[PDB]
Amino acid sequence: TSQVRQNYHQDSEAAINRQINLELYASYVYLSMSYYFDRDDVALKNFAKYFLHQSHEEREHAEKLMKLQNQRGGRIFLQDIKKPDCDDWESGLNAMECALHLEKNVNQSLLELHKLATDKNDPHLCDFIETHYLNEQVKAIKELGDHVTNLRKMGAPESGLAEYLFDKHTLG
Amino acid sequence: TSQVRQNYHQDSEAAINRQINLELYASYVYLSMSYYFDRDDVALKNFAKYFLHQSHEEREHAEKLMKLQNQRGGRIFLQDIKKPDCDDWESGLNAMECALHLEKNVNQSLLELHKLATDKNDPHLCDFIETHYLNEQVKAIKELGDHVTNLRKMGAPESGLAEYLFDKHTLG
Amino acid sequence: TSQVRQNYHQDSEAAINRQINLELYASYVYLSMSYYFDRDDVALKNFAKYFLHQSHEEREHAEKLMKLQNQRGGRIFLQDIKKPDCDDWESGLNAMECALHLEKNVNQSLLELHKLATDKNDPHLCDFIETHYLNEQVKAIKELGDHVTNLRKMGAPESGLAEYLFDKHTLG
Amino acid sequence: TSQVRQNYHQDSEAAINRQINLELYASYVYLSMSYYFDRDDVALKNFAKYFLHQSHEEREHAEKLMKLQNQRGGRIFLQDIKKPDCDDWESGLNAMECALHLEKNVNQSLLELHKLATDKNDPHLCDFIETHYLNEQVKAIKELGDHVTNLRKMGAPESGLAEYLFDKHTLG
Amino acid sequence: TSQVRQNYHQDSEAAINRQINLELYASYVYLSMSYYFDRDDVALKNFAKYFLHQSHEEREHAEKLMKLQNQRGGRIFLQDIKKPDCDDWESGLNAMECALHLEKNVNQSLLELHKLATDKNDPHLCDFIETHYLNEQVKAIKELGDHVTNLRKMGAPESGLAEYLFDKHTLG
Amino acid sequence: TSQVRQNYHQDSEAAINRQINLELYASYVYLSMSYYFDRDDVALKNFAKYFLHQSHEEREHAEKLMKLQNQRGGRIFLQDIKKPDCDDWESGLNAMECALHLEKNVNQSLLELHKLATDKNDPHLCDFIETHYLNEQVKAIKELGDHVTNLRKMGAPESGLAEYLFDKHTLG
Ligand code: NA
Ligand code: NA
Ligand code: NA
Ligand code: NA
Ligand code: NA
Ligand code: NA
Ligand code: NA
Ligand code: NA
Ligand code: NA
Ligand code: NA
Ligand code: NA
Ligand code: NA
Ligand code: NA
Ligand code: NA
Ligand code: NA
Ligand code: NA
Ligand code: NA
Ligand code: NA
Ligand SMILES: [Zn+2]
Ligand SMILES: [Zn+2]
Ligand SMILES: [Zn+2]
Ligand SMILES: [Zn+2]
Ligand SMILES: [Zn+2]
Ligand SMILES: [Zn+2]
Ligand SMILES: [Zn+2]
Ligand SMILES: [Zn+2]
Ligand SMILES: [Zn+2]
Ligand SMILES: [Zn+2]
Ligand SMILES: [Zn+2]
Ligand SMILES: [Zn+2]
Ligand SMILES: [Zn+2]
Ligand SMILES: [Zn+2]
Ligand SMILES: [Zn+2]
Ligand SMILES: [Zn+2]
Ligand SMILES: [Zn+2]
Ligand SMILES: [Zn+2]
Ligand SMILES: [Zn+2]
Ligand SMILES: [Zn+2]
Ligand SMILES: [Zn+2]
Ligand SMILES: [Zn+2]
Ligand SMILES: [Zn+2]
Ligand SMILES: [Zn+2]
Ligand SMILES: [Zn+2]
Ligand SMILES: [Zn+2]
Ligand SMILES: [Zn+2]
Ligand SMILES: [Zn+2]
Ligand SMILES: [Zn+2]
Ligand SMILES: [Zn+2]
Ligand SMILES: [Zn+2]
Ligand SMILES: [Zn+2]
Ligand SMILES: [Zn+2]
Ligand SMILES: [Zn+2]
Ligand SMILES: [Zn+2]
Ligand SMILES: [Zn+2]
Ligand SMILES: [Zn+2]
Ligand SMILES: [Zn+2]
Ligand SMILES: [Zn+2]
Ligand SMILES: [Zn+2]
Ligand SMILES: [Zn+2]
Ligand SMILES: [Zn+2]
Ligand SMILES: [Zn+2]
Ligand SMILES: [Zn+2]
Ligand SMILES: [Zn+2]
Ligand SMILES: [Zn+2]
Ligand SMILES: [Zn+2]
Ligand SMILES: [Zn+2]
Ligand SMILES: [Zn+2]
Ligand SMILES: [Zn+2]
Ligand SMILES: [Zn+2]
Ligand SMILES: [Zn+2]
Ligand SMILES: [Zn+2]
């Protein structure tokens, strides 16, 4: 037992390790998306920048979870970071839709984590999740939904002009 | 075939994808090391900072390789990032020794990549490797060797005082 | 023999004179393109600016090659600069495609020059080419490929609106 | 017919295309002279700088003529830029004498152009020539004549000391 | 074996030790030249300054080679620094000619070193030489050739006025 | 005889040439020591910096002696700079002890030089030595003695921790 451990359940520790892996996976997915939009036959630089920023933010989230694990006296156990489900993301709209789905999956995992923390009477972990993750997820999901709405209304993905102008005026 | 591709061999493209995976793996190893030194029962904050900086640098190297792949008209294919070989790195000296071994492995891969680029008459790729990777690897290996030498001479890992003072005076 | 000449093969000297002519020719092609887009019945000012900048850059490349020739003790022999293959470049997309083809031709000449320098064991010339020309060519080719991709996706050349908006938002 | 064309004779358009070629040729001659003085066995850096500046100025004159052609609704037709009559310019004094002869030839062409514009009742073209070319030519010819006079009086080309000191004190 | 040594051939290590000695020797030669021009019966202060600067630059080159030797895990073995071949350098022109010969000898040694590094498949050493030594040697040789040309054309060494004015206007 | 020579004995001139060689030799010894401490298996960066600074100071002393030789109308005659007696200096303490011995040898040579100048009634040379060398030697010897004392009291060379902490706190 760690000398700092107090009111930290082994189930919570395991769930935090799983969340660390999920955040690293999301970072990897966003990295793949960014460099898809960096291809010469796609060439949407602001889509690339947007998804690279998301990748770095997901890495920061994972590192905050590892810091939490150490603060509470749990032990970090890392697992393989699985490759993203796609090599080719097919369009700005498709990438935004996949990102929306990914963020909702991460949010579901965070909500299950909060439910576990509540069931284990761990208010510090509950507040950690609330303060650093839940509203960030809600804001990200709302922004991605807005982006999907606008791309669809402008006529993406069929309209390369739509994706070009969205890249310039919303993401630039 | 990509409209930008010129004098870029499929073997070189494959080798670059392998190097991308290796750099991401090295980033993951350094991340694990950093948060090992963040544990309450290790508590060497400057070891943690040193290895976190290395992790971020390895990520930047991987992203530079992906950018190169797109610049030359190759296609990025990502693979799983395997978990590090250790969860517990046992000491500052042991972590520095493992980092030295890892950097020499990465350097060997880069040298094989340069040999392939030379054999394929790809001077742009040769110079890319020389400019951005080879001397960085040599400098990193020399620095890690210096750190290992100093820790051993001060009496690590048996001397917790040795690791404490090295953390303060060399890494701080 | 020049008092400064050392390890400089006559074949390399001839190849450098040929490269000087090729760079001057590329400068002339870009000049023609720029002032095509300055016509009242074309009127794409940022296409004109882009190609004029390319023309001046090609002139600078030619002058750097002449400076190299003198540094190594070779002798500059200038030839006629042939007129560009077109007087009318037909569209922004067509001009970008022709520029991509031209840059790939120049890159091929530079790669043959590097192969000659390698065969003659002239590492100074090899590094001169690597440092000042090869990555510039790769970057130019990637940028032109990106431009061609975006123009095609926006609907050029049939879409005068596509070329207008590309002129404003990418080249402006 | 161009929508902007007004009071612009086809003879004037042809003469302007010829002048564009002549200015580009003069630029090329000055480029050759500059890098002759950059040779290790000539080594007069301020002669080299002087003639390189002249080369760039001639390019600017050519581009101003192309801009004029488009402003008036004429169409630019480029021709080969012939190589300079010399590879070796033999001395600072000889190069200055050749430059004087070249500038007087360009001035003669400009005066014939002005006579044509007057005969065609094209006051805009007349004033364009007067404003941007005629006094520039007179000033250049006077300066080159001054340089030739001083070099001859100092004892060039027989006096390498004369050319050295002129390079330092007049052109530096 | 050094813990940092990787892909570093014993032949390359020996060649680097020889190059260190050669650079120190060149530094000594330039020191001798500088203080020859500091003599009361020579009294060319800017020749003295020029050669002293060259001496210090050669020392810096030697120290960079020693740093490289340690970076790669080789071991420095110093040898005697032989005295320069002359005590009296006879004139500014003669000293410049001897310096040109010395720089071409150093360049030949560096080119042989690069050939050895290429034969041993040591791209880090190849790029080290290319980046830090080859173009510096080419530039130094071109500058010395220019100086020799100008001194000869001004009438050195017979013209003490020639050497005086060169000292003032080129080296001052 | 030099036109500036006055009250300058040939014995003094010879002794000054010998002192020039001795100072250059001391510079070389300190250079060797510095790069010994730059080795990956020694890795004491502030020892390396200290001895490199000493090497540069010894070079400056040698150049001041050559300047003196020319000021007095003597003639500089350079000799080989012998290699240092050691390639491996074994420890910070051993290097400091060798440096102390070297500085006392140089001081003895300077004192013999002053005795010669006194015997030859050369007060300018006497004061030159007093002003620029004697107290510098005394200060250097006292500082090296202090360093040796502290290293011995801290437990060097057996205590790698002693040398590490001395490197950090006294030489850093
Ligand atoms: Na767990
Ligand atoms: Na689990
Ligand atoms: Na915490
Ligand atoms: Na591949
Ligand atoms: Na592979
Ligand atoms: Na690239
Ligand atoms: Na030739
Ligand atoms: Na040819
Ligand atoms: Na050069
Ligand atoms: Na015409
Ligand atoms: Na005509
Ligand atoms: Na106009
Ligand atoms: Na050796
Ligand atoms: Na040897
Ligand atoms: Na190195
Ligand atoms: Na003597
Ligand atoms: Na003697
Ligand atoms: Na004096
Ligand atoms: Zn514990
Ligand atoms: Zn659980
Ligand atoms: Zn691409
Ligand atoms: Zn792109
Ligand atoms: Zn964009
Ligand atoms: Zn997240
Ligand atoms: Zn998988
Ligand atoms: Zn696709
Ligand atoms: Zn709350
Ligand atoms: Zn493609
Ligand atoms: Zn391969
Ligand atoms: Zn902990
Ligand atoms: Zn801690
Ligand atoms: Zn700390
Ligand atoms: Zn790396
Ligand atoms: Zn695994
Ligand atoms: Zn442990
Ligand atoms: Zn010549
Ligand atoms: Zn050839
Ligand atoms: Zn027009
Ligand atoms: Zn227009
Ligand atoms: Zn515009
Ligand atoms: Zn070019
Ligand atoms: Zn033609
Ligand atoms: Zn048209
Ligand atoms: Zn718009
Ligand atoms: Zn028209
Ligand atoms: Zn006409
Ligand atoms: Zn030359
Ligand atoms: Zn020159
Ligand atoms: Zn000059
Ligand atoms: Zn003109
Ligand atoms: Zn011709
Ligand atoms: Zn000539
Ligand atoms: Zn060793
Ligand atoms: Zn060898
Ligand atoms: Zn004197
Ligand atoms: Zn003097
Ligand atoms: Zn002077
Ligand atoms: Zn050198
Ligand atoms: Zn000797
Ligand atoms: Zn003499
Ligand atoms: Zn290179
Ligand atoms: Zn004068
Ligand atoms: Zn004398
Ligand atoms: Zn004596
Ligand atoms: Zn070493
Ligand atoms: Zn070291
Ligand atoms: Zn240190
Ligand atoms: Zn001294
Ligand atoms: Zn010896
Ligand atoms: Zn040792
Ligand atoms: Zn006194």
Numbering used by the authors:
A (entry chain D), B (entry chain F), C (entry chain T), D (entry chain E), E (entry chain A), F (entry chain S): 5 to 176
Sentences from the paper on this structure:
Finally, we would like to remind that apoferritin, with its high stability, rigidity, and symmetry, can easily be resolved at atomic resolution by either cryo-EM or X-ray crystallography.
In addition, we also collected a second dataset using a Falcon 4 detector in the electron counting mode (MRC format, not EER format) with a throughput of ~500 movie stacks per hour, resulting in ~7700 movie stacks from a 15 h data collection.
